[PDB]
Symmetry: C2
Subunit: 291 residues, 2 copies
């Protein structure tokens, strides 16, 4: 059980912030509910930070901050169905403000209207148009996409690092967290299926859509992987770090006691979540400098 | 004038946390009042973080985190008169937690009972005893001491970087900020001399004690200097960075709109202060990784 009252307060505010309405609630409605939920917690932009909206590799992006020698590509979460540039605007703006690195957020095509591999193709399109040193970072589904981008980009345009924030990485579901945290606040194991079904339909699953089931992970970017402890996806982070290290990749697992999935939104009201984002920023800075 | 309501609420809470009534209050009483104000805003330790108290170089210190290849030495502020390990505990613990670098905080001898150079002798004693790659960091009076440490240690035992947080650095008081922010919340130009008087008493003014007046700054550690805009000391940061860079030292000046002196304590309730500490942690990480 979570016992931190600040986190309990954040959970209650999230649940109130998102009406259950799970009937005749299209992906379009879920998009409006998610954006409304994020707006509850969304922080302000730094006043002096330059922000531009434009297409990169043909994909709508938002660019935060002046051009820098190293960039950060941020891939937003939302189970491949929801989210966008506005839902994660404050996270991306705060990375740019804290590190002085230009941040590129990607508005990739969403499921179910666009099935896999549309999402990774859009991240690749942006990545390949950057042609510049960059760290890649993402939360939840965006962590998966960041990991899949790294798996596809092991050559000379390798990300300097991958910073994966409570990612889903296509674990097989047998790891302890899936049962331990099956009834976790904010994300139940059973919710993962709805986003799986929207992402792939029922045909074949592209193995690249399951980074943890990829047989050979060698040569991908070094990784900082942070998990919410009270989250069915927690042990995807543990397992991925274990596999990366086994494949010769420098990787660190940070687990966050008492925090649920989605806690980036709690950083303005939870010390644990605030400290987690502080460690995430340090990891981004670390990877950026080491390049 | 500050108009951010979060910062105005922090100022109002600070003023309520600290009933003025000076008039014969002893420095020992001011220490009790400072600690009591700090406790209102002090965040919790990361629960898994190893923390120990030990005398290092003969000076009581607190060590946060496991041994690391690069460490952080933190020097608390308090006008050379108040503060200690407990007043800044959360700041130092959050540095170690976010960066994974071991943090060593120094409880140097305080004025007026101990006058200069007691304080720098104590920082020098810890620095020399540690004998390791480290960033040095400090707020307010701790920033002056960190800058003075760097000026005194320019051989191969130089810090990898100096992170100076709303420091007083020995400006003559003629810069605009001393007039513009003379009536600022939390710190006013009128209060500044009392701290100098306590630090030196009757003694000689050692050039080391006025980093901004030191003729030759060549060869000191690269700097990240962050000022509060609504602080009479703001322009000490601008002036030191200007002189550092002219002396061939890499230095970054970050000024914080809408923030008063002492805003580290506001990072749990102010987005502006939270983002500032996020940038401070990145600067520390950046210096550690370069080194």
């Amino acid at each position: 059980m979570i016992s931190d009252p600040q986190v309990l307060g954040f959970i209650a505010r999230t649940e109130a912030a998102y009406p259950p309405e799970a009937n005749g609630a299209s992906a379009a409605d879920n998009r409006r509910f998610y954006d409304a939920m994020c707006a509850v917690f969304r922080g302000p932009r730094p006043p002096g930070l330059v922000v531009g909206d434009r297409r990169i590799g043909g994909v709508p992006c938002r660019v935060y901050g002046a051009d820098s020698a190293v960039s950060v590509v941020y891939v937003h979460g939302g189970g491949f169905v929801v989210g966008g540039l506005d839902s994660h605007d404050d996270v991306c703006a705060e990375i740019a403000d804290a590190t002085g690195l230009q941040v590129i957020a990607i508005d990739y095509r969403l499921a179910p209207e666009h099935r896999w591999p549309a999402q990774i193709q859009d991240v690749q399109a942006v990545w390949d148009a950057l042609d510049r040193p960059a760290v890649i970072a993402g939360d939840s589904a965006g962590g998966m996409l960041s990991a899949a981008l790294c798996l596809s980009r092991r050559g000379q345009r390798q990300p300097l690092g991958q910073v994966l924030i409570y990612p889903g990485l296509g674990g097989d579901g047998s790891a302890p967290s899936y049962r331990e945290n099956a009834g976790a606040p904010l994300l139940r194991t059973e919710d993962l299926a709805t986003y799986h079904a929207a992402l792939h339909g029922d045909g074949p699953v592209d193995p690249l859509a399951l980074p943890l089931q990829v047989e050979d992970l060698a040569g991908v970017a070094p990784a900082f992987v942070v998990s919410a402890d009270v989250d069915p996806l927690r042990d995807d982070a543990r397992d991925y770090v274990q596999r990366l290290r086994a494949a010769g990749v420098a990787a660190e697992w940070r687990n966050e006691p008492e925090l649920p999935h989605g806690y980036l939104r709690a950083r303005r009201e939870s010390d644990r979540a605030r400290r987690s984002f502080q460690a995430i920023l340090s990891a981004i800075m670390r990877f950026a400098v080491r390049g």
